């Protein structure tokens, strides 16, 4: 199995903070990078930034997973454009249980099963507490 690389693309500091939070739990990560879209960022500049990262990692023979905050919006639109061109894989709605499971099992499952796994874990991890 090829080594994987996770690119987190989100609004503002969400991705940067999500990774920080995960790293409190599972320690400092390699092979994870975050890109945040801030007010005042030109989306085409950010898109070219992201494409630069993807090419570099592909050239390192890595398999790329893009995790995004929200279905819809500029980060998602960038991720979609990268899937159109580079055949990376994409999942939306990223939360903490998903990212922790993703990063601790990244070597265990192939990308398709990995994404199915964390989709399930992410949804199951959302609970309203009663009492």
């Amino acid at each position: 199995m090829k080594e994987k690389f996770v690119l987190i693309i989100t609004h503002g500091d969400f991705g940067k903070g999500l990774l920080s939070g995960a790293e409190v739990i599972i320690g400092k990560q390699e092979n994870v990078h975050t890109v945040g879209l801030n007010l005042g960022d030109n989306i085409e500049k950010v898109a070219k930034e992201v494409m630069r990262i993807i090419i570099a990692k592909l050239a390192e023979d890595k398999e790329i997973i893009i995790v995004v905050d929200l279905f819809g919006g500029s980060p998602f639109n960038i991720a979609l454009e990268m899937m159109k061109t580079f055949d990376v894989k994409v999942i939306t709605g990223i939360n903490m249980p998903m990212l922790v499971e993703l990063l601790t099992s990244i070597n265990v499952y192939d990308t398709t099963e990995l994404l199915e796994n964390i989709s399930k874990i992410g949804k199951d991890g959302i609970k309203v507490i009663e009492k």
Binding site: K48, M51, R52, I53, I55, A56, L58, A59, K84, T85
Partner: protein
């Protein structure tokens, strides 16, 4: 934008030294390629260790694509060389005539980028189209 690249297949062969700069030039070439109409399925990226391997890598790449039944219409060999290569410019030049397809010179020869890469994208599309049927 006077050149329609929708029916073209373009190869990009890049070196892996100075990767950060390499990636940006590739990204620029990819961007401009798609702006002329060249489809994603038709942009084939492959790598070699260094710029020296670019000329022969290009031939092997072109021959492989023929055996796959998906021939390249042009190729962009991309390399970054810092004096911190002259023969190389010569083989890439000659390769136009040996391979029978446009070989766009995408090798930076600096002493110490996206736009430059786009230029190479625009060139590939034009050279594969302008003089055809």
């Amino acid at each position: 934008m006077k050149y329609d690249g929708s029916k073209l297949r373009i190869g990009i062969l890049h070196a892996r030294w100075n990767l950060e700069i390499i990636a940006a030039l590739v990204a620029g070439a990819i961007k401009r390629l798609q702006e002329f109409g060249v489809k994603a399925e038709n942009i084939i990226i492959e790598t070699v260790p260094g710029s020296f391997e670019l000329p022969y890598g290009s031939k092997l790449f072109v021959e492989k694509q023929k055996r796959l039944g998906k021939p390249l219409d042009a190729i962009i060999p991309i390399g970054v060389l810092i004096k911190g290569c002259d023969s190389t410019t010569h083989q890439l030049m000659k390769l136009n005539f040996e391979l029978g397809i446009p070989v766009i010179f995408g090798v930076l020869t600096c002493l110490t980028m996206h736009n430059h890469g786009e230029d190479w994208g625009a060139a590939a599309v034009e050279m594969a189209t302008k003089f055809n049927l």
